[PDB]
Amino acid sequence: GMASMRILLSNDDGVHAPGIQTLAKALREFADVQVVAPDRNRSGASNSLTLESSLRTFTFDNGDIAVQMGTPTDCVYLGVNALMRPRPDIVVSGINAGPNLGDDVIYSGTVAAAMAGRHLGFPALAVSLNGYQHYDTAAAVTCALLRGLSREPLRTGRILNVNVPDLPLAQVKGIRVTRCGSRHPADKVIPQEDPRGNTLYWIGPPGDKYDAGPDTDFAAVDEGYVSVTPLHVDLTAASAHDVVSDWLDSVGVGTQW
Amino acid sequence: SHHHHHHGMASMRILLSNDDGVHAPGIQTLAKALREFADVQVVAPDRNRSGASNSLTLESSLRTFTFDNGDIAVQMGTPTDCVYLGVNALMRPRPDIVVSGINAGPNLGDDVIYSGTVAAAMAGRHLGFPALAVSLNGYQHYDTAAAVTCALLRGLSREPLRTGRILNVNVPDLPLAQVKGIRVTRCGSRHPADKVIPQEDPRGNTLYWIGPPGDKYDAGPDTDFAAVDEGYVSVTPLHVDLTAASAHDVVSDWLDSVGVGTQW
Numbered sequence: 001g002m003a004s005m006r007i008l009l010s011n012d013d014g015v016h017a018p019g020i021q022t023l024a025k026a027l028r029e030f031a032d033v034q035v036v037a038p039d040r041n042r043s044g045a046s047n048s049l050t051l052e053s054s055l056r057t058f059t060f061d062n063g064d065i066a067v068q069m070g071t072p073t074d075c076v077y078l079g080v081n082a083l084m085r086p087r088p089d090i091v092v093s094g095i096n097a098g099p100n101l102g103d104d105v106i107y108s109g110t111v112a113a114a115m116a117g118r119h120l121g122f123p124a125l126a127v128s129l130n131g132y133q134h135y136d137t138a139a140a141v142t143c144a145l146l147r148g149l150s151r152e153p154l155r156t157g158r159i160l161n162v163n164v165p166d167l168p169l170a171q172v173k174g175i176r177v178t179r180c181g182s183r184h185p186a187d188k189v190i191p192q193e194d195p196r197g198n199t200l201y202w203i204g205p206p207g208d209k210y211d212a213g214p215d216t217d218f219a220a221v222d223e224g225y226v227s228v229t230p231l232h233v234d235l236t237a238a239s240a241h242d243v244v245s246d247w248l249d250s251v252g253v254g255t256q257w
Numbered sequence: 258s259h260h261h262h263h264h265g266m267a268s269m270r271i272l273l274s275n276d277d278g279v280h281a282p283g284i285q286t287l288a289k290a291l292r293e294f295a296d297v298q299v300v301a302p303d304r305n306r307s308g309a310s311n312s313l314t315l316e317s318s319l320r321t322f323t324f325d326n327g328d329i330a331v332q333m334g335t336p337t338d339c340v341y342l343g344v345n346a347l348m349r350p351r352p353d354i355v356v357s358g359i360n361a362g363p364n365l366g367d368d369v370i371y372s373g374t375v376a377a378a379m380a381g382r383h384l385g386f387p388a389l390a391v392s393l394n395g396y397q398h399y400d401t402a403a404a405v406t407c408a409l410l411r412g413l414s415r416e417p418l419r420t421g422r423i424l425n426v427n428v429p430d431l432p433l434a435q436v437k438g439i440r441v442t443r444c445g446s447r448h449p450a451d452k453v454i455p456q457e458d459p460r461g462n463t464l465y466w467i468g469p470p471g472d473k474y475d476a477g478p479d480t481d482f483a484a485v486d487e488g489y490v491s492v493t494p495l496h497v498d499l500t501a502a503s504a505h506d507v508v509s510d511w512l513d514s515v516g517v518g519t520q521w
């Protein structure tokens with residue numbers, strides 16, 4: 001083949017995570033892979049990034065790069081813009097231990113790292129396992145996608161959010177393009193007293209599934225299919241445009257009459 | 258009955274947060290304005306968290322500190338933690354709405370997915386009134402951003418806003434008299450940011466700064482960038498759904514075409 005694929009691999013769980021190390025191993029059978037990922041498994045970074053401080057990096061013997069206290073986004077940013085020359089063809093983020101579905105996606109560091117490689121020659125993949133077991137299956141599904149992208153370019157969609165059923169590969173039904181489901185608002189806080197009687201608060205579990213119908217990511221994964229949802233960064237709720245303009249006129253905001 | 262700019266000194270309960278933290282001039286100016294006519298509770302980060310984006314604290318609990326005036330700082334809390342805790346635990350009576358702001362600096366374009374200002378408003382989307390994220394295009398005219406936010410809040414008192422759960426509001430950094438009006442906008446977009454600034458530590462290790470956002474790419478006439486450049490307050494309604502609906506078919510055809518995951 002005329003060209004090697006050069007892949008920037010990141011994740012949310014840090015460089016030591018088995019999900020990213022399993023995927024790296026699988027990708028390296030056919031691709032060049034540079035890992036740039038958080039130094040440790042931190043929870044809940046979303047697409048935060050480090051602006052108030054400079055970031056420190058560390059290179060392992062195998063060449064993996066960990067960014068110290070780096071967010072998922074930090075790592076992809078540094079990887080694309082400084083640490084990999086020339087720039088990667090594609091950012092692959094995963095494999096995440098745990099699903100990234102529905103309206104959770106915006107909170108996902110795994111998705112954020114992909115999000116950050118949306119301007120490369122291929123659409124970025126965010127890869128999450130619905131579980132902790134079959135990294136092998138998600139690795140294989142990722143490999144298949146990537147061979148697919150190199151066979152024919154995907155013309156529209158700069159980020160693909162891929163959720164893989166936690167099954168042995170032979171039981172995965174196939175792949176469906178899906179939209180993000182939704183959840184009810186999350187509302188649990190779990191209070192816990194410290195030894196001095198002060199109340200500290202844990203953020204609780206997500207809200208219950210609300211939109212999990214036939215074409216959602218939630219449905220696809222439950223039915224044993226890989227879910228693929230293309231994502232974009234534009235948060236515009238266009239359907240609300242007229243209602244909002246009409247409301248402002250109605251309440252006299254921005255207009256004198 | 259009596260004629261005043263606002264009807265009631267505490268007609269609505271507002272959870273006010275931001276991402277610059279509880280000491281920020283943005284939030285303090287706004288708080289003072291809102292307290293004219295609203296029952297305001299500040300729940301905000303203990304310090305600056307710009308580009309905390311929608312992150313949240315899941316593997317540790319959080320501790321709060323309450324100031325003399327009743328402001329709550331969530332110690333190391335992200336803007337999302339603050340709203341989530343304020344809404345779901347701390348506030349009684351619960352808020353009618355979340356206001357987030359006034360941020361020192363704009364939250365325009367494809368930057369909005371990175372804004373902690375916007376993330377706090379996004380955590381308040383389920384409440385009765387749409388959550389407002391208010392960011393000043395600059396550092397000067399907090400007064401102007403406060404007047405704008407007060408005008409939208411009074412407006413919500415006149416008539417509820419039916420569709421649209423977050424409103425991202427950018428306000429030109431001008432005296433109020435020079436703001437031309439309001440536009441309902443769409444998010445513009447930027448080129449990829451591409452600068453990384455290296456800086457040696459005292460030991461000669463190279464550390465890296467994240468550079469500024471990339472150039473404007475789409476600043477067309479109905480965008481938030483254009484509105485603010487032209488001296489209008491931009492209001493973009495936002496959602497949290499990241500699905501690229503208009504890419505669905507293309508992706509679907511692509512998969513069929515290369516046959517990934519299908520036997521033949």
Ligand SMILES: Nc1ncnc2[nH]cnc12
Nearest residue numbers: 368371450467468469470
């Ligand atoms: N990629 C990026 N996105 C948002 N804000 C930034 N500031 C610097 N780089 C940025």
Ligand SMILES: [Mg+2]
Nearest residue numbers: 012013096097
């Ligand atoms: Mg994770």
Ligand SMILES: [Mg+2]
Nearest residue numbers: 276277307360
């Ligand atoms: Mg800020």
